[PDB]
Design a protein around this ligand. Structure first.
Ligand SMILES: Nc1ncnc2c1ncn2[C@@H]1O[C@H](COP(=O)(O)OP(=O)(O)OP(=O)(O)O)[C@@H](O)[C@H]1O
Ligand SMILES: Nc1ncnc2c1ncn2[C@@H]1O[C@H](COP(=O)(O)OP(=O)(O)OP(=O)(O)O)[C@@H](O)[C@H]1O
Ligand SMILES: [Mg+2]
Ligand SMILES: [Mg+2]
Lengths: 46, 485, 376
């Protein structure tokens, strides 16, 4: 059991974190455009 | 490149790192090692220390006696028989075994083991037993304790390897090599307690190779103590060493007599041509002189040594010291130099015995200065006052000051107070320590009379007597002044 | 002769002459219940064998490797009969530089080829992942790390016994150790009994034309050697010494076994050989270790000079004379002298006296002498 090991690496099995607002009735392109607006404002700050 | 430190004195031996298990392609490919030129042993400095005499030196009558009493077997016959029977049975059966021998110093362990292997080599020279290789490993003659691994393998194969490679080679040789391709090896492990490390790997390996079926190895282990495995070794090694252990007891006085008179067979009660011009004596202006040692002198020497230790070295050195005392008395009265009947009787032996037993300690504190004895007297007074076996140095300072200022009616104290506190000057101010205070303290520390603690405060640092209090008071009572107050 | 052959067969290096030791027939099946289980199903499990020294653990496991069995590839004949593949090595762990190299030592047994650097459990695991492998580890106690606290001392052994149970790796780990010198399945080799030692002795002596011992002698030796330490090496040494005493003094019999135990094994006789001057010194020394209880020679001698002045029995003697009588009591076996740093504000090396002689027999020998009774 790897839980009894001190450290172990994992290779797991296998597009934006912004979620759909307005009680789940937001447009998908509104979510993407919010993501790009946050990215440009955050870049302009940093 | 820039180095963080340097090692400019590294001296590294030319020893290979590859063990014997890789020396051949397989176990079946190993040849007969007995028919190998470098295996089993098949003195370049002895001409360095010679020179021409350009003189004829004088050998008096006592000189042959003193050379016959040097350390360089009438009483060891049962131990010889046991060690010989075990080693003989192990050699001629191709068996591996351990023979354990213990004893106090000088009781003949090394001499008996060497004579046993000499008689075994004589037996194998006339084909009574198979031929074997004899190896001596003395644990006190090794720089590192692992060097025994380097030594034994070099005695077996002729290779020079490093110690871990040597011990791998020895493990492979004892374990895997067949008996028909091998030779018997008898290993004397002398001073076994010196081969004891923190992890007992050397002891385990040496006694575990004797439990291998193919090893053909006999280990004679010589130790100080009967229960050295029980005191310092693990239970596996104690199991492998065995329960059968051979004790070499100290000699009784009849056996010490037998040893001494075996040393004095050819010159005791014998005549010499003495040549009294120079004193140089030749064994058969010139006189025929009988030389004898008293039998009662050997009796009292042997009795004292046998009661104390049973050491043969001690008995031989006592008789040699008696002969030296007699020779010094003899050469004093004639002026013979070095370039009737002369006897080593009872009194020379008694003066030789008592010169090791008289204590210089009380004689040493007798001949000290007044200030050192005053230190010791104040320390004794503090030890009896507060009952402590450890006194602060500031207390000793105050006690010395009190003894000087209380016994101020004593004439010696009147004469010595100005010396002790002003060095008799009346230009030196009055001192807080006496003159030679640090001198006598350091002197009693170098002599080992005192112990001092490592503190940098001088007043609260403590001091202890390392010698007996009875000796200190007996020294203090010999003085005329300190026994008065 | 036949004395020579019996002596050769009674050595600890004697040859092991269907695959079980003569008094071990239980435990061998237990190891079979580890082997024929995990060889067939290719499981990863860990065995751990304990026992006192000389219980047959190395001998039985070597017989198992010899008769019932990449470099060390063999065939294992199953009870079903599949003859399946296993690589078996046997490593004594004392002949190892560091404990942490044991994984590398596992690799050098099972390697033709490339030589990799293995300094952890992970490398040996990923080497053994794409393949079964059985490693017998003699002297498991050598894997302990000294002076490294209780948790970190068992570091390598936890790695070995954890990888010995890991899924989709094929590793069986048999670790023998000794209990007096120190989860996997635990098997204990119990110490041999006198009947088992009799069985072992007659089965070993069966190859000779005749048995040179009387059988009450063999049973007496077995009963006197068994117990809480049933070490077979001790019994072999006792019988070999009996043959040796017979050969020196000349069937064997009981008297030679008893003479072995008489020669190779008391404070009443030591006191009785002493001079009244020597007897007073021993009385003062045990009296000296009553008040101080960690006292030197010069503190014991100081107490001795106190006892004389209130009694005036015998002339008072000097310190060096006191030490040689104390050295006389070394060589007859009553007083013991060591050297260690004293416990106190000053820490330098002093010589001390310790005494362990039986106190029950000391008071009996000294109360008979009237002048010594003040000194108890
Ligand atoms: N039985 C003896 N007969 C004659 N000389 C003896 C006898 N025993 C000892 N000696 C002498 O005393 C010396 C010391 O003996 P040996 O070297 O064998 O002592 P040891 O028991 O090994 O002691 P240690 O523990 O100090 O090494 C010998 O070299 C020899 O000169
Ligand atoms: N049942 C037996 N029958 C015959 N010989 C035996 C038996 N058990 C042990 N022996 C022998 O006893 C000797 C020591 O046994 P072994 O080395 O196997 O002990 P051990 O339990 O591994 O002890 P240790 O922890 O000291 O290594 C060997 O010579 C071996 O052949
Ligand atoms: Mg010696
Ligand atoms: Mg074993």
């Amino acid at each position: 059991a790897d839980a009894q090991r001190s450290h172990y690496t994992v290779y797991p099995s296998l597009h934006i974190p912004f979620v759909k607002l307005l009680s789940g009735k937001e447009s998908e392109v509104n979510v993407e455009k919010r993501w790009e607006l946050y990215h440009q404002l955050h870049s302009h700050f940093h | 490149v820039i180095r963080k430190f340097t090692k400019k004195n590294v001296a590294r031996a030319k020893k290979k790192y590859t063990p014997f298990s890789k020396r051949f392609k397989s176990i079946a490919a190993i040849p007969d090692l007995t028919s190998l030129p470098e295996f089993y042993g098949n003195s370049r400095f002895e001409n360095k220390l010679k020179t021409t005499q350009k003189h004829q030196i004088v050998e008096t009558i006592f000189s042959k006696v003193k050379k016959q009493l040097n350390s360089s077997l009438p009483a060891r016959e049962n131990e010889f028989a046991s060690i010989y029977l075990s080693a003989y049975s192990a050699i001629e059966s191709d068996s591996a075994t351990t023979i354990y021998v213990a004893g106090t110093p000088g009781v003949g362990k090394t001499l008996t083991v060497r004579e046993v292997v000499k008689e075994l080599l004589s037996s194998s020279a006339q084909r009574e037993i198979p031929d074997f290789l004899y190896v001596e490993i003395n644990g006190l003659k090794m720089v590192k304790p692992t060097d025994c691994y380097e030594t034994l393998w070099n005695k077996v194969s002729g290779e020079r390897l490093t110690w871990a490679a040597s011990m791998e080679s020895l493990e492979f040789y004892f374990k895997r090599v067949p008996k028909n391709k091998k030779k018997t090896i008898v290993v004397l492990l002398d001073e076994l307690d010196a081969m004891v490390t923190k992890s007992q790997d050397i002891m385990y390996n040496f006694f575990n190779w004797t439990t291998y079926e193919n090893a053909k190895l006999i280990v004679i282990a010589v130790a100080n103590t009967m229960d050295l495995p029980e005191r310092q070794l693990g239970n596996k090694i104690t199991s492998r060493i065995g329960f059968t252990r051979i004790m070499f007891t100290g000699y009784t006085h009849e056996e010490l007599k037998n040893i001494i008179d075996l040393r004095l067979k050819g010159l005791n009660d014998s005549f010499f041509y003495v040549d009294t011009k120079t004193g140089n004596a030749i064994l058969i202006d010139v006189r025929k002189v009988r030389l004898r040692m008293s039998a009662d002198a050997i009796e009292i020497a042997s009795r004292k040594v046998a009661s104390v230790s049973g050491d043969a070295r001690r008995a031989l050195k006592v008789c040699k010291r008696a002969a030296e005392i007699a020779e010094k008395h003899y050469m004093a009265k004639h002026g013979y130099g070095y370039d009737g009947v002369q006897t080593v009787h009872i009194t020379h032996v008694m003066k030789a015995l008592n010169e090791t037993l008289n204590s210089h300690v009380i004689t040493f504190m007798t001949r000290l200065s007044f200030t050192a004895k005053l230190f010791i007297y104040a320390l004794l007074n503090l030890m009896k006052k507060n009952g402590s076996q450890e006194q602060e140095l500031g207390d000793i300072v105050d006690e010395i000051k009190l003894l000087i200022e209380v016994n101020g009616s004593n004439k010696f104290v009147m004469e010595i107070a100005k010396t002790l506190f002003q060095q008799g000057s009346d230009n030196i101010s009055e001192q807080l320590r006496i003159i030679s205070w640090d001198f006598v303290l350091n002197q009693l520390l170098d002599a080992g009379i005192l112990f001092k603690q490592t503190m940098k405060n001088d007043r609260i640092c403590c001091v202890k007597l390392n010698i007996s209090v009875e000796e200190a008071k007996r020294a203090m009572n010999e003085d005329e002044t300190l026994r008065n107050l | 002769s036949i004395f020579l052959r019996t002596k050769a067969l009674l050595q600890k290096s004697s040859e092991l002459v269907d695959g079980a030791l003569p008094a071990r027939t239980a435990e061998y099946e237990q190891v079979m219940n580890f082997l024929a289980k995990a060889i067939s199903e290719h499981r990863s499990d860990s065995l751990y064998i304990t026992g006192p020294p000389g219980t047959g653990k190395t001998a039985q496991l070597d017989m198992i490797i010899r008769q019932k069995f990449l470099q060390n590839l063999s065939w294992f004949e199953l009870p079903d009969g599949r003859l399946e593949s296993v690589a078996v090595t046997s490593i004594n762990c004392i002949s190892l530089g560091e404990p942490s190299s044991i994984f590398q030592k596992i690799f050098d047994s099972f390697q033709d080829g490339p030589t990799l650097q293995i300094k952890n459990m992970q490398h040996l695991q990923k080497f053994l992942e794409p393949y079964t492998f059985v490693v017998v580890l003699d002297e498991m106690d050598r894997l302990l790390h000294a002076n490294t606290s209780e948790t970190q001392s068992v570091r390598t052994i936890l790695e070995l016994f954890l990888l010995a149970k890991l899924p989709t790796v094929s590793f069986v780990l048999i670790g023998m150790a000794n209990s007096l010198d120190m989860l996997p399945q635990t098997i204990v080799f119990q110490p041999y009994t006198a009947e088992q030692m009799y069985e072992i002795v007659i089965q070993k002596m069966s190859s000779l034309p005749t048995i040179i011992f009387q059988p009450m002698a063999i049973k007496f030796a077995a009963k006197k050697c068994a117990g809480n330490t049933g070490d077979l090496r001790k019994l072999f040494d006792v019988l070999r010494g009996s043959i040796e005493i017979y050969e020196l003094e000349k069937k064997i019999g009981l008297n030679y076994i008893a003479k072995v135990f008489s020669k190779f094994v008391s404070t009443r006789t030591r006191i009785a050989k002493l001079n009244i001057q020597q007897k007073l010194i021993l009385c003062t020394i045990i009296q000296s270790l009553k008040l101080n209880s960690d006292a030197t020679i010069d503190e014991s001698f100081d107490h001795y000079i106190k006892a004389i002045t209130k009694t005036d029995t015998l002339a008072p003697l000097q310190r060096n004379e006191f030490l040689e009588i104390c050295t006389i009591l070394e060589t007859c076996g009553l007083v013991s002298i060591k050297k260690t740093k004293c416990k106190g504000k000053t820490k330098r090396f002093v010589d001390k006296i310790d005494v362990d002689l039986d106190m029950r027999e000391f008071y009996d020998e000294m109360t008979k002498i009237s002048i010594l009774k003040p000194f108890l």
